[PDB]
Amino acid sequence: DVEFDALLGSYCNTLSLVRFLELGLSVACVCTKFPELAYMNEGRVQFEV
Amino acid sequence: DVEFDALLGSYCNTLSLVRFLELGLSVACVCTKFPELAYMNEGRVQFEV
């Protein structure tokens, strides 16, 4: 008697790595970085109109 | 501790300089200027028909 079992393939998934500036939405942003943001209580943005 | 910063990604548009001779309406005028109008009493314009 000859009998056996088998694995006939193992299939996986790859996560799509999405960057934000690669999107078409990024016109509504001005993506500038605070190196310090955790240290801030009140922030105001002042500009001349 | 009050930190003063300035962006480098975005700049304002404060003034919107509109000139009257940029408009389409400036056909309907004859824009000739005096540098002396306040010194003038009744000025007159003639027509011969």
mmCIF file with all atom_site columns, all heavy atoms in Angstrom, chain A residues 29-30 32 34 36 45 47-49, chain B residues 3 5 7-10 12-14:
data_model
loop_
_atom_site.group_PDB
_atom_site.id
_atom_site.type_symbol
_atom_site.label_atom_id
_atom_site.label_alt_id
_atom_site.label_comp_id
_atom_site.label_asym_id
_atom_site.label_entity_id
_atom_site.label_seq_id
_atom_site.pdbx_PDB_ins_code
_atom_site.Cartn_x
_atom_site.Cartn_y
_atom_site.Cartn_z
_atom_site.occupancy
_atom_site.B_iso_or_equiv
_atom_site.pdbx_formal_charge
_atom_site.auth_seq_id
_atom_site.auth_comp_id
_atom_site.auth_asym_id
_atom_site.auth_atom_id
_atom_site.pdbx_PDB_model_num
ATOM 1   N N   . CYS A 1 29 ? -3.242 70.158 0.184  1.00 0.00 ? 29 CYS A N   1
ATOM 2   C CA  . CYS A 1 29 ? -2.305 70.268 1.282  1.00 0.00 ? 29 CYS A CA  1
ATOM 3   C C   . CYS A 1 29 ? -1.238 71.303 0.986  1.00 0.00 ? 29 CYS A C   1
ATOM 4   O O   . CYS A 1 29 ? -1.049 71.735 -0.152 1.00 0.00 ? 29 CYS A O   1
ATOM 5   C CB  . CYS A 1 29 ? -1.614 68.933 1.537  1.00 0.00 ? 29 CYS A CB  1
ATOM 6   S SG  . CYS A 1 29 ? -2.658 67.624 2.101  1.00 0.00 ? 29 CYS A SG  1
ATOM 7   N N   . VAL A 1 30 ? -0.549 71.703 2.048  1.00 0.00 ? 30 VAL A N   1
ATOM 8   C CA  . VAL A 1 30 ? 0.829  72.183 1.976  1.00 0.00 ? 30 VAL A CA  1
ATOM 9   C C   . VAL A 1 30 ? 1.573  71.333 3.002  1.00 0.00 ? 30 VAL A C   1
ATOM 10  O O   . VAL A 1 30 ? 1.532  71.601 4.205  1.00 0.00 ? 30 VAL A O   1
ATOM 11  C CB  . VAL A 1 30 ? 0.966  73.678 2.278  1.00 0.00 ? 30 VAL A CB  1
ATOM 12  C CG1 . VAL A 1 30 ? 2.427  74.070 2.280  1.00 0.00 ? 30 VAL A CG1 1
ATOM 13  C CG2 . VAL A 1 30 ? 0.220  74.500 1.252  1.00 0.00 ? 30 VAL A CG2 1
ATOM 14  N N   . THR A 1 32 ? 4.210  70.480 4.925  1.00 0.00 ? 32 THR A N   1
ATOM 15  C CA  . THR A 1 32 ? 5.436  70.924 5.568  1.00 0.00 ? 32 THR A CA  1
ATOM 16  C C   . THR A 1 32 ? 5.495  70.366 6.985  1.00 0.00 ? 32 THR A C   1
ATOM 17  O O   . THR A 1 32 ? 4.470  70.215 7.654  1.00 0.00 ? 32 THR A O   1
ATOM 18  C CB  . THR A 1 32 ? 5.495  72.449 5.593  1.00 0.00 ? 32 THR A CB  1
ATOM 19  O OG1 . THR A 1 32 ? 4.382  72.933 6.341  1.00 0.00 ? 32 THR A OG1 1
ATOM 20  C CG2 . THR A 1 32 ? 5.377  73.015 4.199  1.00 0.00 ? 32 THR A CG2 1
ATOM 21  N N   . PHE A 1 34 ? 6.551  69.908 10.950 1.00 0.00 ? 34 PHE A N   1
ATOM 22  C CA  . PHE A 1 34 ? 7.033  70.338 12.252 1.00 0.00 ? 34 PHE A CA  1
ATOM 23  C C   . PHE A 1 34 ? 8.000  69.282 12.768 1.00 0.00 ? 34 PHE A C   1
ATOM 24  O O   . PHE A 1 34 ? 7.575  68.155 13.031 1.00 0.00 ? 34 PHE A O   1
ATOM 25  C CB  . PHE A 1 34 ? 5.893  70.482 13.262 1.00 0.00 ? 34 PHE A CB  1
ATOM 26  C CG  . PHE A 1 34 ? 5.108  71.752 13.169 1.00 0.00 ? 34 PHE A CG  1
ATOM 27  C CD1 . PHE A 1 34 ? 3.816  71.797 13.666 1.00 0.00 ? 34 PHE A CD1 1
ATOM 28  C CD2 . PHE A 1 34 ? 5.622  72.886 12.578 1.00 0.00 ? 34 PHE A CD2 1
ATOM 29  C CE1 . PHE A 1 34 ? 3.064  72.938 13.609 1.00 0.00 ? 34 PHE A CE1 1
ATOM 30  C CE2 . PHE A 1 34 ? 4.859  74.045 12.507 1.00 0.00 ? 34 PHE A CE2 1
ATOM 31  C CZ  . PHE A 1 34 ? 3.578  74.064 13.016 1.00 0.00 ? 34 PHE A CZ  1
ATOM 32  N N   . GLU A 1 36 ? 9.257  69.794 15.701 1.00 0.00 ? 36 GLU A N   1
ATOM 33  C CA  . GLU A 1 36 ? 8.590  69.802 16.992 1.00 0.00 ? 36 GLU A CA  1
ATOM 34  C C   . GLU A 1 36 ? 7.126  70.180 16.793 1.00 0.00 ? 36 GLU A C   1
ATOM 35  O O   . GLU A 1 36 ? 6.805  71.243 16.255 1.00 0.00 ? 36 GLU A O   1
ATOM 36  C CB  . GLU A 1 36 ? 9.311  70.710 18.008 1.00 0.00 ? 36 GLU A CB  1
ATOM 37  C CG  . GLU A 1 36 ? 9.346  72.219 17.781 1.00 0.00 ? 36 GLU A CG  1
ATOM 38  C CD  . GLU A 1 36 ? 10.472 72.663 16.875 1.00 0.00 ? 36 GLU A CD  1
ATOM 39  O OE1 . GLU A 1 36 ? 11.056 71.819 16.169 1.00 0.00 ? 36 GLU A OE1 1
ATOM 40  O OE2 . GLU A 1 36 ? 10.777 73.870 16.872 1.00 0.00 ? 36 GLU A OE2 1
ATOM 41  N N   . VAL A 1 45 ? -1.305 81.181 12.998 1.00 0.00 ? 45 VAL A N   1
ATOM 42  C CA  . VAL A 1 45 ? -0.715 81.439 11.696 1.00 0.00 ? 45 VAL A CA  1
ATOM 43  C C   . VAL A 1 45 ? -1.128 82.836 11.275 1.00 0.00 ? 45 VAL A C   1
ATOM 44  O O   . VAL A 1 45 ? -2.324 83.132 11.175 1.00 0.00 ? 45 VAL A O   1
ATOM 45  C CB  . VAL A 1 45 ? -1.153 80.392 10.668 1.00 0.00 ? 45 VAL A CB  1
ATOM 46  C CG1 . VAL A 1 45 ? -0.640 80.760 9.311  1.00 0.00 ? 45 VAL A CG1 1
ATOM 47  C CG2 . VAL A 1 45 ? -0.633 79.044 11.076 1.00 0.00 ? 45 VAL A CG2 1
ATOM 48  N N   . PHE A 1 47 ? -0.717 86.076 8.556  1.00 0.00 ? 47 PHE A N   1
ATOM 49  C CA  . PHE A 1 47 ? -0.298 86.498 7.231  1.00 0.00 ? 47 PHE A CA  1
ATOM 50  C C   . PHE A 1 47 ? -1.119 87.704 6.801  1.00 0.00 ? 47 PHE A C   1
ATOM 51  O O   . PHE A 1 47 ? -2.224 87.940 7.296  1.00 0.00 ? 47 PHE A O   1
ATOM 52  C CB  . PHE A 1 47 ? -0.384 85.348 6.218  1.00 0.00 ? 47 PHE A CB  1
ATOM 53  C CG  . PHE A 1 47 ? -1.765 84.804 5.997  1.00 0.00 ? 47 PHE A CG  1
ATOM 54  C CD1 . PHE A 1 47 ? -2.524 85.223 4.920  1.00 0.00 ? 47 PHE A CD1 1
ATOM 55  C CD2 . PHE A 1 47 ? -2.271 83.815 6.819  1.00 0.00 ? 47 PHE A CD2 1
ATOM 56  C CE1 . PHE A 1 47 ? -3.782 84.703 4.703  1.00 0.00 ? 47 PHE A CE1 1
ATOM 57  C CE2 . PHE A 1 47 ? -3.531 83.297 6.608  1.00 0.00 ? 47 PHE A CE2 1
ATOM 58  C CZ  . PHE A 1 47 ? -4.282 83.741 5.547  1.00 0.00 ? 47 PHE A CZ  1
ATOM 59  N N   . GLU A 1 48 ? -0.554 88.467 5.869  1.00 0.00 ? 48 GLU A N   1
ATOM 60  C CA  . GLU A 1 48 ? -1.078 89.773 5.492  1.00 0.00 ? 48 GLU A CA  1
ATOM 61  C C   . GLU A 1 48 ? -2.114 89.632 4.386  1.00 0.00 ? 48 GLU A C   1
ATOM 62  O O   . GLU A 1 48 ? -1.816 89.096 3.314  1.00 0.00 ? 48 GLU A O   1
ATOM 63  C CB  . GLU A 1 48 ? 0.053  90.683 5.017  1.00 0.00 ? 48 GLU A CB  1
ATOM 64  C CG  . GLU A 1 48 ? 1.048  91.063 6.085  1.00 0.00 ? 48 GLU A CG  1
ATOM 65  C CD  . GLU A 1 48 ? 2.150  91.950 5.543  1.00 0.00 ? 48 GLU A CD  1
ATOM 66  O OE1 . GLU A 1 48 ? 2.203  92.143 4.309  1.00 0.00 ? 48 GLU A OE1 1
ATOM 67  O OE2 . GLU A 1 48 ? 2.959  92.460 6.348  1.00 0.00 ? 48 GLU A OE2 1
ATOM 68  N N   . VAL A 1 49 ? -3.321 90.122 4.637  1.00 0.00 ? 49 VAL A N   1
ATOM 69  C CA  . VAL A 1 49 ? -4.344 90.238 3.607  1.00 0.00 ? 49 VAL A CA  1
ATOM 70  C C   . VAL A 1 49 ? -4.777 91.689 3.557  1.00 0.00 ? 49 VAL A C   1
ATOM 71  O O   . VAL A 1 49 ? -5.285 92.221 4.550  1.00 0.00 ? 49 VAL A O   1
ATOM 72  C CB  . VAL A 1 49 ? -5.556 89.334 3.872  1.00 0.00 ? 49 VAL A CB  1
ATOM 73  C CG1 . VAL A 1 49 ? -6.646 89.624 2.859  1.00 0.00 ? 49 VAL A CG1 1
ATOM 74  C CG2 . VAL A 1 49 ? -5.157 87.886 3.793  1.00 0.00 ? 49 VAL A CG2 1
ATOM 75  N N   . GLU B 1 3  ? 8.032  80.557 20.059 1.00 0.00 ? 3  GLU B N   1
ATOM 76  C CA  . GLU B 1 3  ? 8.867  80.356 18.886 1.00 0.00 ? 3  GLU B CA  1
ATOM 77  C C   . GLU B 1 3  ? 8.240  81.032 17.675 1.00 0.00 ? 3  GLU B C   1
ATOM 78  O O   . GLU B 1 3  ? 7.035  80.903 17.443 1.00 0.00 ? 3  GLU B O   1
ATOM 79  C CB  . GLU B 1 3  ? 9.050  78.867 18.619 1.00 0.00 ? 3  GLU B CB  1
ATOM 80  C CG  . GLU B 1 3  ? 10.032 78.576 17.521 1.00 0.00 ? 3  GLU B CG  1
ATOM 81  C CD  . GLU B 1 3  ? 10.181 77.095 17.261 1.00 0.00 ? 3  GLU B CD  1
ATOM 82  O OE1 . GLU B 1 3  ? 9.458  76.298 17.901 1.00 0.00 ? 3  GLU B OE1 1
ATOM 83  O OE2 . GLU B 1 3  ? 11.025 76.727 16.415 1.00 0.00 ? 3  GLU B OE2 1
ATOM 84  N N   . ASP B 1 5  ? 8.338  81.250 13.599 1.00 0.00 ? 5  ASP B N   1
ATOM 85  C CA  . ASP B 1 5  ? 8.792  80.504 12.434 1.00 0.00 ? 5  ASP B CA  1
ATOM 86  C C   . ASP B 1 5  ? 8.264  81.151 11.160 1.00 0.00 ? 5  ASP B C   1
ATOM 87  O O   . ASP B 1 5  ? 7.506  82.120 11.188 1.00 0.00 ? 5  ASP B O   1
ATOM 88  C CB  . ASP B 1 5  ? 8.353  79.038 12.511 1.00 0.00 ? 5  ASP B CB  1
ATOM 89  C CG  . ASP B 1 5  ? 9.036  78.282 13.629 1.00 0.00 ? 5  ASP B CG  1
ATOM 90  O OD1 . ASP B 1 5  ? 10.139 78.691 14.041 1.00 0.00 ? 5  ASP B OD1 1
ATOM 91  O OD2 . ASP B 1 5  ? 8.486  77.255 14.079 1.00 0.00 ? 5  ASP B OD2 1
ATOM 92  N N   . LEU B 1 7  ? 7.269  79.758 6.949  1.00 0.00 ? 7  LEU B N   1
ATOM 93  C CA  . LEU B 1 7  ? 7.230  78.676 5.981  1.00 0.00 ? 7  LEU B CA  1
ATOM 94  C C   . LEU B 1 7  ? 8.211  78.930 4.851  1.00 0.00 ? 7  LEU B C   1
ATOM 95  O O   . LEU B 1 7  ? 8.663  80.054 4.629  1.00 0.00 ? 7  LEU B O   1
ATOM 96  C CB  . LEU B 1 7  ? 5.833  78.507 5.396  1.00 0.00 ? 7  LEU B CB  1
ATOM 97  C CG  . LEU B 1 7  ? 4.743  78.038 6.347  1.00 0.00 ? 7  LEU B CG  1
ATOM 98  C CD1 . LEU B 1 7  ? 3.418  77.989 5.626  1.00 0.00 ? 7  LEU B CD1 1
ATOM 99  C CD2 . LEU B 1 7  ? 5.098  76.686 6.906  1.00 0.00 ? 7  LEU B CD2 1
ATOM 100 N N   . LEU B 1 8  ? 8.551  77.859 4.144  1.00 0.00 ? 8  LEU B N   1
ATOM 101 C CA  . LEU B 1 8  ? 9.322  77.948 2.914  1.00 0.00 ? 8  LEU B CA  1
ATOM 102 C C   . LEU B 1 8  ? 8.608  77.265 1.763  1.00 0.00 ? 8  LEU B C   1
ATOM 103 O O   . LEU B 1 8  ? 9.196  77.092 0.691  1.00 0.00 ? 8  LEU B O   1
ATOM 104 C CB  . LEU B 1 8  ? 10.704 77.333 3.101  1.00 0.00 ? 8  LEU B CB  1
ATOM 105 C CG  . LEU B 1 8  ? 11.569 78.092 4.092  1.00 0.00 ? 8  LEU B CG  1
ATOM 106 C CD1 . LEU B 1 8  ? 12.811 77.296 4.393  1.00 0.00 ? 8  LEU B CD1 1
ATOM 107 C CD2 . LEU B 1 8  ? 11.919 79.431 3.498  1.00 0.00 ? 8  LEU B CD2 1
ATOM 108 N N   . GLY B 1 9  ? 7.363  76.861 1.965  1.00 0.00 ? 9  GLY B N   1
ATOM 109 C CA  . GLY B 1 9  ? 6.641  76.152 0.939  1.00 0.00 ? 9  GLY B CA  1
ATOM 110 C C   . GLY B 1 9  ? 5.537  76.978 0.330  1.00 0.00 ? 9  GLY B C   1
ATOM 111 O O   . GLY B 1 9  ? 5.112  76.698 -0.790 1.00 0.00 ? 9  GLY B O   1
ATOM 112 N N   . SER B 1 10 ? 5.066  78.001 1.039  1.00 0.00 ? 10 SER B N   1
ATOM 113 C CA  . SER B 1 10 ? 3.894  78.744 0.603  1.00 0.00 ? 10 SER B CA  1
ATOM 114 C C   . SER B 1 10 ? 4.003  80.226 0.922  1.00 0.00 ? 10 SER B C   1
ATOM 115 O O   . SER B 1 10 ? 4.291  80.612 2.058  1.00 0.00 ? 10 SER B O   1
ATOM 116 C CB  . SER B 1 10 ? 2.641  78.173 1.230  1.00 0.00 ? 10 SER B CB  1
ATOM 117 O OG  . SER B 1 10 ? 2.389  76.901 0.681  1.00 0.00 ? 10 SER B OG  1
ATOM 118 N N   . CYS B 1 12 ? 2.214  84.285 0.236  1.00 0.00 ? 12 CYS B N   1
ATOM 119 C CA  . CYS B 1 12 ? 0.901  84.905 0.090  1.00 0.00 ? 12 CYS B CA  1
ATOM 120 C C   . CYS B 1 12 ? 0.769  85.698 -1.207 1.00 0.00 ? 12 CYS B C   1
ATOM 121 O O   . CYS B 1 12 ? 1.739  85.956 -1.913 1.00 0.00 ? 12 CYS B O   1
ATOM 122 C CB  . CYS B 1 12 ? 0.615  85.841 1.253  1.00 0.00 ? 12 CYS B CB  1
ATOM 123 S SG  . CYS B 1 12 ? 0.401  84.989 2.773  1.00 0.00 ? 12 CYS B SG  1
ATOM 124 N N   . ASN B 1 13 ? -0.474 86.071 -1.517 1.00 0.00 ? 13 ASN B N   1
ATOM 125 C CA  . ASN B 1 13 ? -0.796 87.083 -2.520 1.00 0.00 ? 13 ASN B CA  1
ATOM 126 C C   . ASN B 1 13 ? -1.556 88.185 -1.799 1.00 0.00 ? 13 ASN B C   1
ATOM 127 O O   . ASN B 1 13 ? -2.779 88.110 -1.646 1.00 0.00 ? 13 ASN B O   1
ATOM 128 C CB  . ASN B 1 13 ? -1.633 86.520 -3.659 1.00 0.00 ? 13 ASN B CB  1
ATOM 129 C CG  . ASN B 1 13 ? -0.849 85.628 -4.567 1.00 0.00 ? 13 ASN B CG  1
ATOM 130 O OD1 . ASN B 1 13 ? 0.333  85.858 -4.806 1.00 0.00 ? 13 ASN B OD1 1
ATOM 131 N ND2 . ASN B 1 13 ? -1.513 84.625 -5.122 1.00 0.00 ? 13 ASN B ND2 1
ATOM 132 N N   . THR B 1 14 ? -0.828 89.204 -1.355 1.00 0.00 ? 14 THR B N   1
ATOM 133 C CA  . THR B 1 14 ? -1.440 90.292 -0.604 1.00 0.00 ? 14 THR B CA  1
ATOM 134 C C   . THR B 1 14 ? -2.233 91.215 -1.520 1.00 0.00 ? 14 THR B C   1
ATOM 135 O O   . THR B 1 14 ? -3.443 91.391 -1.347 1.00 0.00 ? 14 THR B O   1
ATOM 136 C CB  . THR B 1 14 ? -0.364 91.078 0.143  1.00 0.00 ? 14 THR B CB  1
ATOM 137 O OG1 . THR B 1 14 ? 0.557  91.639 -0.800 1.00 0.00 ? 14 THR B OG1 1
ATOM 138 C CG2 . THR B 1 14 ? 0.385  90.173 1.093  1.00 0.00 ? 14 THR B CG2 1
#
